[PDB]
């Protein structure tokens, strides 16, 4: 059993939602949940880690993410 890491997702308005994901989780699942909770279409948003686009099938392992890393959300637009 691998552990969850907790990521902070920062919106355009500086609001924050934190997500627990495993190192092998495909990050589309985070994107979909975030968009759902914001009440906007997932394709209206782009999700960045250190300024680089997060793909649907990127994993935290591929991106080298760790506990407390930040994802920023911008309009696609």
């Amino acid at each position: 059993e691998g552990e969850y890491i907790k990521l902070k997702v920062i919106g355009q308005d500086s609001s924050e939602i934190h997500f627990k994901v495993k190192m092998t989780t495909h990050l589309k699942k985070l994107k979909e949940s975030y968009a759902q909770r914001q009440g906007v279409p997932m394709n209206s948003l782009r999700f960045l880690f250190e300024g680089q686009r997060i793909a649907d099938n990127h994993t935290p392992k591929e991106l080298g993410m760790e506990e407390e890393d930040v994802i920023e959300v911008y309009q696609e637009q």
Binding site: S15, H18, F19, K22, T25, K29, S33, R37
Partner: peptide
């Protein structure tokens, strides 16, 4: 705002 943490986690079928 309060802290928000979200956890990202057929033979019986009838349709």
């Amino acid at each position: 705002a309060e802290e928000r943490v979200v956890v990202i986690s057929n033979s019986s079928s009838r349709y």
